[PDB]
Symmetry: C3
Subunit: 429 residues, 3 copies
């Protein structure tokens, strides 16, 4: 029989988009100096071990796509980031010929020059670390002497403005020529810092374990041999990275009296759970099903996360475990591996009189060429004849929310807990 009709199904349009950027970064060869961080509120007193390995913010959307691209992508509901790849090439590493201390003849033609590469240090359960901006001494510009108050949000915002510049109506427009237009180098200021407990004021049983041997977890090469060579090549497939929420479905509550029905989930977990842990061991690990959350499209939608655009530079691209879909789903926790590259500090040719680390360093810069590609996909489903696009209600998305109404999102800024990136309340920009 001639089939006059056949189940061709819905009309769905899938769009794949690619975002590419090229960035040139200058990195300081910061010395390895212990800095004291005083206790503040819930933060204990700790020792900080500074490094010269600059953080590469490849986990954020501004790294791959310009404000124009971001604004246009906003008009594509259902957009998911598919894969993010970054390639880092280092160029000739400059080392100061002399320290500038006139009282010594330390100038020399010879250089020992090492490049440090750190993949996934952020996820190591026992190396408590985060990326920090330092303040430096005037006599020794390469020696950290404290911490800048610049937060991670402010750092990434400043880096974005250096990448793309100001708006034409900005009075400060001339200050930052866009590196996306010029191709000029950008100074990085956000470096890996290793922390350990400070037991000087600790009462009771002190932990006196020193630092973890973090140099056993990084790669280091002779930077003289690495000129114009690829040093980092990492791809990442996103588990769940909703950049724009799905098209809202036609609400079945307007058609059906069964919208609030119940059905068996069996032994499968179709609702995600939040795990709370306590490294102080005052409380056992806790798993709580049905965390507070609300839809990011539909009649009672709360789109604060996507209207505050947390996902451009404040919050990492991948948010697996933060977002639920209303269907039989498998959801796991997610992390993007951290990338830190830098030059080891070059000691001065002075001769110190004691068996210890060098106390004076030559100025040295790492020159890193960064190639980054981001792939995204969006959908245009037509479940209904009129009224525009509508998705299936099984494509409805929820986002974890705090009880005060602030969206909860993954953050890569704080140190890991048991190798996990925490979920934290988003802050209104």
């Amino acid at each position: 029989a001639t089939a006059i009709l056949r189940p061709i199904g819905l009309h769905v349009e899938k769009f794949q988009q690619t975002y590419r950027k090229k960035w040139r970064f200058l990195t300081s060869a910061n010395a390895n100096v212990i800095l004291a961080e005083a206790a503040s509120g819930e933060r204990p007193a700790r020792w900080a071990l500074t490094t010269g390995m600059a953080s590469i913010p490849w986990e954020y959307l501004f790294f791959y796509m310009s404000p124009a691209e971001y604004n246009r992508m906003k008009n594509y509901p259902g957009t998911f980031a598919k894969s993010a790849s970054v390639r880092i090439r280092t160029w000739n590493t400059r080392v100061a010929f002399q320290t500038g201390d006139t009282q010594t003849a330390n100038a020399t033609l010879n250089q020992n020059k090492f490049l440090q590469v750190a993949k996934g240090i952020r996820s190591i359960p026992f190396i408590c670390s985060t990326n920090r901006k330092y303040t430096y001494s005037d006599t020794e510009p390469m020696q950290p002497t404290g911490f800048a108050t610049l937060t991670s949000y402010e750092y990434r915002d400043g880096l974005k403005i250096a990448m793309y510049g100001y708006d034409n109506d900005s009075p400060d427009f001339a200050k930052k020529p866009p590196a996306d237009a010029t191709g000029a180098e950008i100074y990085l200021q956000d470096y890996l810092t290793i922390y350990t407990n400070d037991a000087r004021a600790t009462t009771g049983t002190k932990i006196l374990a020193g630092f973890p041997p973090y140099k056993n977890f990084i790669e280091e090469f002779d930077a003289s041999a690495c000129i114009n060579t690829d040093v980092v090549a990492m791809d990442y497939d996103f588990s769940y990275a909703p950049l724009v929420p799905q098209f809202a479905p036609v609400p079945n509550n307007l058609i059906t009296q069964n919208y609030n029905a119940s059905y068996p989930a069996g032994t499968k977990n179709e609702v995600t759970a939040a795990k709370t842990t306590d490294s102080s061991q005052a409380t056992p690990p806790t798993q709580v099903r049905n965390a507070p959350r609300k839809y990011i499209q539909g009649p009672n939608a709360d789109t604060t996360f996507f209207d505050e655009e947390q996902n451009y530079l404040r919050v990492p691209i991948e948010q697996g475990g933060i977002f639920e879909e209303v269907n039989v789903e498998t959801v796991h926790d997610t992390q993007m591996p951290s990338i830190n590259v830098g030059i080891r500090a070059v000691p001065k040719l002075t001769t110190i009189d004691e068996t210890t680390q060098a106390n004076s360093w030559l100025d040295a810069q790492g020159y890193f060429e960064v190639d980054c590609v981001l792939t995204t996909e969006s959908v245009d489903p037509y479940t209904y004849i009129k009224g525009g696009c509508y998705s299936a209600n099984t494509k409805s998305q929820l986002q974890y929310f705090a009880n005060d109404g602030r969206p909860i999102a993954k953050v890569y800024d704080n140190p890991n807990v048991y190798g996990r990136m925490q979920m934290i309340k988003t802050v209104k920009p």
Copy 2:
């Protein structure tokens, strides 16, 4: 060494039974007419799109096995339905030679004649549909003009009585000669209906998406070429279809003081959970472990579901996710695919003066031969020497119950929620 004894284990007797029926169904080629359904209580105002695709009740036990077989199967505890298969063959489709409107000469030898087949429309998340009985206009017998109050339970009971007849003591015995004895055709009256929201009285943001293009999800063939041809051939393996509860185990509480003990389930879910969802998006999806339930055999058994025989025609055969077993079990939600077949309405040869759908249709009937087979299995375990059959306590079964004591069961009558059949309270017959 000569083994005088070896672990031969228990004596268990497994019985496999087959139930076959042949039914001949007559289907009306109902027109596609929009019907208004006024809001009633929790049901909103909606538009109904009528079709001529008659529902095939292959998900119910009366479809395969007669009252005598059902009554005998009651005496086989531990009976599970294993597989249900249905084969549908269509015969010559009759179309009225003339409409009967004397004021027109619409009689014609020529016919355009189409058969519609719909598999799994009930499970489509975005096509809100259910099977309904219509009322028809007198001048146009093939045009629905409303809904009959006949419910799904009443419809399936009437169809069962048409299939098998009354008891010999019934005063109305002569009214329904059994089709199981005669082989005569039975008129089907339960047709697929597509629903959409009615926004005439809607206050606020209206959804004006019209209807979903449901004809993109059905098969249609020239019925003139389908004479004596198989059109539906579907098999279904039941995940969990307990027709008669297991043999009750010997209660360990009469032998042991450890009967109320606790043991680790680990990270496995050995207890099922009920998922509550809200398409109005007023409440997030909720998963609740340890839903109220009670045993269907044993000292505190509640056998209301199996004594009210919900499972004959009121409730579908498969109840996966409704029934728990006391052991390490994997349980998932279950659905039987819906089958709707019918003839598209044949327009009258009159010439209408406006660009629109036909307003008059010829009488047309689909002639469908239905072959159905049901396979069941039961067990006779002898854990003990005396007293009759007893099963292992790991074979104990629980059924979900509401707090008022009404058994909860799966139903295929209401429209799907996120592609799921709901669980609802059973009603006492």
Copy 3:
């Protein structure tokens, strides 16, 4: 480029240890006699069917390793039992030449001599059984006439003292020469007992199912043909058998303000749950996530289980489902199969006048050579430069605890519930 550094990671030292013992056991051919056990508190009145199959305590640590080895293993934190294997060889089985009843000439050269082997009877859901010590009649030394009050803890302690002897300062030192030094035979006194309900005082619907046919689940061989032959050869890989807790990690709460953070678990269960069941069917099976528990190392450690050394002879080696680790973990319930071996009772050559079981038995002993091997592994992780060994915080372990502070552990002493070994509160030694 020449890599001056590469990620060699941590220094971790793994130590594998082997523990071997050889034991010679003498088993009585106890008669199959029904014993009444009166109701006591929560324990109902029941009938007990005695057997001669002696329990082999291969599930406990004292079976494989001496007090010196146990005390030294205490100084290896992070020790897990890996595998336990037992080989049982039976030697010539002695049968009394005569019963000693002078009023009969029952002495005979001829013997019918059978060896009974029972693997995994403890896990059978419908055979409610446990191992018991009997009291015997004076005229018939092989006939049980009651139960000794000796508990399982006391039995295993006495067997341990027979295996290894007393301390040199003990006044009772001469009473028990160590079998680990002498190689002498040890009399076993702990035999499989089959239970069934006693309905003499039962009010209401009585269960009169008799006994389960337990002889359909054991192996039996002609013991005359089994002289110097292997009869049991069983290996067991432990799922989780922590003998000494891990090295405590450096507490991140002393370094980080994020220690009490939350992260998504997704749909995975990273926290174990305890399943409570009710064979009386008064309560449905219940699964409870986040059972009370506390760490076995770290700042708030509760090491009562490992300081009371429950794991030497009071509690079985494997405790899977009792112990949690703070990470994405898969945990399941665990059981070690039971081993019971013995000689069937040899009837007297007297002629009884009634059709029934023999009422007099010859003395018979089983001679069983038991070879047992236990493999354990421990770790020495160095996450930090100073202060000694520290593990990753993902290696932190928690143990289930009751609300009163008593550690919860698996026990193989009580009869199974739905084929599961229960978790019970440990008792302070």
